[PDB]
Amino acid sequence: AVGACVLCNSQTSLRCGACIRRPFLCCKCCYDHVISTSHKLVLSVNPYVCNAPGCDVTDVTQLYLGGMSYYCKSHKPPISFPLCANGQVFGLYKVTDFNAIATCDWTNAGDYILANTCTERLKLFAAETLKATEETFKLSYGIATVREVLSDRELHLSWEVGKPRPPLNRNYVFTGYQIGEYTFEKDAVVYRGTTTYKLNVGDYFVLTSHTVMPLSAPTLVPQEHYVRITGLYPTLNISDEFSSNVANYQKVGMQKYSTLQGPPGTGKSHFAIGLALYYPSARIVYTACSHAAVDALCEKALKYLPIDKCSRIIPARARVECFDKFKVNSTLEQYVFCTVNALPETTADIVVFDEISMATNYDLSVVNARLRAKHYVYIGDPAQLPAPRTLLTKGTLEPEYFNSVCRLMKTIGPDMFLGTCRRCPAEIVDTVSALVYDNKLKAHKDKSAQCFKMFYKGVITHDVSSAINRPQIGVVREFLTRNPAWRKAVFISPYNSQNAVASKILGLPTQTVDSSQGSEYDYVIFTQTTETAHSCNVNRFNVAITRAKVGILCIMSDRDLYDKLQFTSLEI
Numbered sequence: 001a002v003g004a005c006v007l008c009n010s011q012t013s014l015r016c017g018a019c020i021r022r023p024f025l026c027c028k029c030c031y032d033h034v035i036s037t038s039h040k041l042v043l044s045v046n047p048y049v050c051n052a053p054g055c056d057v058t059d060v061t062q063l064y065l066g067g068m069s070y071y072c073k074s075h076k077p078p079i080s081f082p083l084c085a086n087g088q089v090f091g092l093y094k095v096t097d098f099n100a101i102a103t104c105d106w107t108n109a110g111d112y113i114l115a116n117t118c119t120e121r122l123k124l125f126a127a128e129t130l131k132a133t134e135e136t137f138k139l140s141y142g143i144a145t146v147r148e149v150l151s152d153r154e155l156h157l158s159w160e161v162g163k164p165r166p167p168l169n170r171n172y173v174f175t176g177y178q179i180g181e182y183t184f185e186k187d188a189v190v191y192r193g194t195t196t197y198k199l200n201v202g203d204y205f206v207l208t209s210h211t212v213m214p215l216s217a218p219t220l221v222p223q224e225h226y227v228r229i230t231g232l233y234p235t236l237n238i239s240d241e242f243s244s245n246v247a248n249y250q251k252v253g254m255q256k257y258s259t260l261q262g263p264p265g266t267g268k269s270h271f272a273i274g275l276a277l278y279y280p281s282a283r284i285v286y287t288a289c290s291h292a293a294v295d296a297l298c299e300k301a302l303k304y305l306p307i308d309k310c311s312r313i314i315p316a317r318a319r320v321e322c323f324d325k326f327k328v329n330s331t332l333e334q335y336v337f338c339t340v341n342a343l344p345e346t347t348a349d350i351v352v353f354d355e356i357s358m359a360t361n362y363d364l365s366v367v368n369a370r371l372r373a374k375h376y377v378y379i380g381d382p383a384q385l386p387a388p389r390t391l392l393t394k395g396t397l398e399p400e401y402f403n404s405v406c407r408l409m410k411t412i413g414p415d416m417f418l419g420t421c422r423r424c425p426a427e428i429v430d431t432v433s434a435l436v437y438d439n440k441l442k443a444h445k446d447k448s449a450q451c452f453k454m455f456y457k458g459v460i461t462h463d464v465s466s467a468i469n470r471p472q473i474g475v476v477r478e479f480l481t482r483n484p485a486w487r488k489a490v491f492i493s494p495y496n497s498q499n500a501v502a503s504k505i506l507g508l509p510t511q512t513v514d515s516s517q518g519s520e521y522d523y524v525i526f527t528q529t530t531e532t533a534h535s536c537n538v539n540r541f542n543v544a545i546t547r548a549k550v551g552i553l554c555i556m557s558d559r560d561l562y563d564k565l566q567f568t569s570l571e572i
């Protein structure tokens with residue numbers, strides 16, 4: 001009820017009642033909000049509404065102070081002062097960017113640009129507002145009910161009339177009814193139940209709309225530079241394996257926070273785990289948004305760090321499987337691996353936040369609120385994929401606007417850059433180096449002579465909006481007959497519907513570009529499927545072709561990206 005101004009910090013009792021997060025505003029800033037926007041409801045212990053019986057005047061510009069009460073122009077007493085006058089709204093202890101964050105619908109790219117270019121408190125206001133908007137949008141969707149059960153993995157659904165149907169992919173996680181979370185993939189639909197239960201007919205699912213908590217901590221803590229390693233104790237016996245990162249590990253101990261840009265296969269988790277060997281007494285918390293990113297850090301830690309000092313933090317609501325080898329939920333172990341939403345309230349000597357392109361400003365802030373650390377390290381790559389922005393439908397979100405860490409990496413550059421790709425055949429490294437890394441990424445591997453490209457537009461069909469290209473899958477099938485070593489390839493495309501078709505026709509394991517991020521395979525077969533902004537996205541393209549260790553086959557739709565691929569072209 002009585003708090004601090006989200007703009008200039010000048011204490012007040014005035015909260016905007018029209019803002020979905022109800023932020024406190026000072027006398028000066030509340031005025032500049034109500035007179036420039038449709039937002040006219042002003043709060044305190046008592047709201048600014050006409051006290052005269054049965055009067056519906058709530059607009060603060062049409063209200064006045066009659067002693068210690070509030071009334072409109074039609075009900076005010078002779079001795080009454082306007083609540084809105086002289087650039088101020090009457091309150092105790094007596095902006096363009098704040099207005100736009102407060103009133104935008106978050107469907108445009110410019111809304112996200114602003115949410116990242118504004119002041120720090122406006123970043124938290126923006127992150128709270130966006131997350132709250134995203135959750136209330138889930139409520140707009142229709143309830144799905146089980147009509148019949150075909151088998152242990154297939155079912156038929158009945159939808160609510162009037163309310164739209166959400167897109168079916170492993171992106172949208174429903175909550176069965178409390179029979180556990182469930183996901184869907186396309187009249188022959190497949191049901192992916194997180195908890196194994198006999199799919200009851202009549203039982204329904206609904207999109208988990210968790211409540212949005214307020215943000216207290218900043219996205220980035222204030223930067224501190226030191227002239228000596230602070231609170232960390234190095235070794236002069238770090239294995240040659242991690243010696244390439246000694247100068248960077250020291251930079252970590254000489255700054256409050258540091259950023260690491262690591263292109264694919266340049267040694268990000270090797271750097272992250274090697275930081276524990278360089279400061280062997282330090283308590284380190286390894287965090288990331290996804291369970292898969294946390295698990296990939298667990299796998300590297302399992303190889304170099306003592307297993308008895310490790311613990312994998314798993315929340316009670318087990319939404320999918322997790323890394324099994326560390327002791328579970330022992331919050332007190334020297335090494336703690338946990339997702340951002342499951343983080344306990346604790347301290348650390350170092351906090352490592354991985355896959356930073358997937359973080360939102362909300363995630364950056366939660367980490368600063370749940371973890372108080374001597375040093376924070378942000379590992380990721382702004383040339384890789386960002387978190388899906390479900391409300392964003394107009395415009396494209398550039399990497400400098402993914403989050404505060406990405407913004408720093410794209411404007412002032414990263415503190416540390418891993419320049420040598422050790423995963424990919426040089427054809428791939430040379431392509432992405434020119435495409436997204438300003439020719440600064442170098443190849444450790446030779447050219448494999450197993451990277452191919454084919455320009456084939458085929459025929460584009462759609463499953464609602466998720467696209468399919470059966471002729472591009474036909475070309476893959478023909479290629480497989482002539483190149484049987486490729487029988488072990490992973491099939492990748494920008495669309496679930498393309499992947500579902502390729503799975504039945506080719507029999508290859510399937511993966512979307514977005515779900516492939518962080519993973520590597522010997523052989524990759526990629527079909528572009530369409531020439532949309534989604535399938536032409538250079539960060540998505542970069543992720544797609546950098547999954548391969550040995551060979552890649554790219555069936556392309558876009559001439560531009562095809563021409564850039566430094567691969568042997570194939571005929572047909």
Ligand SMILES: COc1ccc(C)cc1NC(=O)CN
Pocket residue numbers: 430563564565566567568569
């Ligand atoms: C657009 O570049 C290419 C396209 C196709 C092939 C076979 C090679 C290159 N470029 C190189 O191998 C580096 N000069």
Ligand SMILES: [Zn+2]
Pocket residue numbers: 005006007008009010025026027028029030
């Ligand atoms: Zn203010």
Ligand SMILES: [Zn+2]
Pocket residue numbers: 016017018019033039102
């Ligand atoms: Zn408002």
Ligand SMILES: [Zn+2]
Pocket residue numbers: 050051052055056057071072073074075
């Ligand atoms: Zn009135």
